[PDB]
A paper describes a structure:
D,L-endopeptidase RipA is the major PG hydrolase required for daughter cell separation in Mycobacterium tuberculosis ( Mtb ), as RipA defects severely hinder cell division and increase antibiotic vulnerability. Despite extensive studies, the mechanisms governing Mtb RipA regulation remain controversial and poorly understood. Here, we report an integrative structural and functional analysis of the SteAB system, a regulatory complex that has been shown to modulate cell separation in the model organism Corynebacterium glutamicum ( Cglu ) and is conserved across Mycobacteriales .
In addition, crystallographic characterization of the cytoplasmic core of SteA revealed a homodimeric organization harboring a conserved functional pocket similar to the phosphonucleotide-binding site of thiamine pyrophosphokinase. These data, coupled with the in vivo phenotypic analysis of a steAB knockout mutant of Cglu , support a model in which the transmembrane SteAB heterotetramer, driven by cytoplasmic ligand binding, orchestrates the productive periplasmic positioning of RipA, leading to PG hydrolysis activation.
Residue numbers in the entry:
A (entry chain H): 16 to 342
B (entry chain A): 12 to 342
The structure:
């Protein structure tokens, strides 16, 4: 198959130039229906993917739509497909999945046939059902054994009257939490929310010049400057009351409270603690948890994370939503 | 003297002046169904002789430990007095509570209550704990079934109509006809003016948007329940349809000669359809006004809750913000 080699992204890179009969170069694992529809409307001879069209986690119909439209599908070329592509140059794709610029080999891919794409979809369909049966089975078990915490707030320490009626901002050490905190500088200055630092993000808050009211996490993994900043330290403890890191708190001579529970995440503990104190709102920075993340996780996801987000209900807002008000 | 516990009758609320002056040995009068641990802790610290509830301490939907904390503290619990307890109470007047749960002001009967013993409160807790497990087994069993049969919608957006490029990258505000949605929309006047979000009116809230002087880009719902002014405003009308494509209210749209699209699905709520439609078009954010759905609502329901509602909120993830959060930025 001979045609122009056009690099396409779901955001609209080469979709406007993609003509009938050319070779589309994409990097789209788990190809979305929207991107497949845009590719299908352009009528390309073949879609060459750097990654796999169906990775196996979710049943995505996109690759089958392309095959039904008479488009050749070749996948798993790898980064060398993007590194060796000249946008617009007439390429040549063989029936074996090889891409050439005349007689020069650029990349080797794996041809995805119609029946193989149907099988991958059916396998992903069964995989999602099995993972969701396990996940929501664990959700029922979690609610049953942790109802004292979810319903009564058993174990949640009383941190005083500082949170009630106020805006709260919780910072967790997720990817790019520091740059999100910097985008929220005007928000923090203008609204003066109660700051809660979780684990290593308590260090980040203190390094940015803040004085968090609360710090949540095992003090073993929190810096000395954050622990000595004046914040009330909330230590996760086993349901029996044993708190790891209490010796460090006692060595420092600082005030601390324990939060006995079976919840492993200190971000979920901080969210449940803030909610229990009846705030006006809770801005969650560096701790995002979504349904799509649960569906795409090939490993077991913790039901306590999605249940905590649902428990906070209408009071929860992600830091990215607030930062978009300042863009 | 006449038998029973004698003490001053004081009306207490989970956030009132009654607690701040509730003294040791008083008969606390409350109206707290499913008594919270926080309110039980504040009542316990005051050391009243008895706590008299208008409602039941444990109604049976959730396992609440509060009543047992009071009983462990040596407080007599009497419940189910009804509104006549609040109507017949005089704050600070010395009342008499018999072992049978009767409240008197001397020899005059005010109200009859049911004595809640420690073992009966433990049994009510254990029963509410089993009823909650049964409901959650039913609820999350339906959630698994929903994900399996509706994966083309949740994963691929199958059935979601293409409304054009107006939503992508923009802030979106969806209005549903929940309680006080009009007064929430009025509190968001500065937000709408300052940020110019894409407006989506759901059902009767499309009428509210048009009455407030707005021109919603989209209207979602059965046109049978939407006003003529909203349907003729210039908005693209999205009709909920059965999985087979049958849309109720299509005859009305065709009589008006206006543009419309259908959204075939097994989701019953037009608010969930509007949220799934907005999310599929990749917005910057989705401000949700008049349609709140929470986990506490699922726990408290007792009737069957729709898993599609909570799954929709989780599907939108980090892009979802309640209108009350945005309105708090203007207070």
């Amino acid at each position: 198959l001979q045609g122009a080699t056009r690099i396409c992204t779901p955001q609209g890179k080469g979709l406007k130039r993609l003509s009938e009969g050319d070779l589309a170069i994409i990097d789209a694992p788990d190809l979305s229906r929207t991107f497949a529809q845009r590719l299908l409307a352009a009528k390309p001879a073949a879609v060459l993917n750097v990654s796999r069209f169906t990775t196996g986690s979710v049943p995505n119909f996109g690759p089958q739509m392309l095959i039904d439209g008479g488009i050749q599908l070749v996948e798993g070329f790898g980064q060398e497909l993007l590194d060796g592509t000249k946008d617009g140059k007439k390429g040549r794709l063989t029936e074996d999945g090889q891409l050439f610029y005349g007689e020069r080999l650029i990349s080797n891919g794996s041809v995805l046939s119609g029946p193989a794409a149907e099988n991958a979809f059916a396998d992903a369909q069964q995989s999602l059902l099995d993972r969701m049966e396990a996940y929501f089975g664990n959700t029922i078990q979690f609610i049953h054994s942790e109802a004292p915490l979810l319903i009564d707030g058993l174990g949640i320490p009383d941190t005083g009257n500082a949170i009630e009626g106020r805006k709260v901002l919780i910072a967790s050490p997720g990817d790019n939490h520091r740059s999100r905190l910097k985008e929220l500088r005007s928000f923090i200055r203008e609204y003066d929310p109660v700051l809660i630092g979780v684990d290593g993000a308590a260090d980040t808050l203190v390094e940015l010049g803040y004085k968090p009211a609360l710090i949540v996490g095992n003090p073993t993994g929190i810096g000395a400057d954050a622990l000595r900043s004046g914040a009330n330290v909330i230590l996760p403890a086993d349901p029996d009351g044993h708190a790891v890191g209490l010796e460090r708190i006692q060595d420092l001579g600082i005030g601390a409270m324990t939060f006995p529970s079976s919840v492993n995440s200190s971000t979920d503990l901080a969210l449940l603690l803030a909610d229990f104190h009846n705030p006006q709102m809770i801005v969650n920075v560096g701790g995002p948890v979504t349904l799509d993340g649960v569906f795409e996780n090939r490993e077991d996801s913790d039901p306590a994370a999605l249940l905590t987000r649902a428990k906070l209900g209408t009071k929860l807002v992600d830091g990215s939503v607030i930062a978009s008000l300042y863009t």
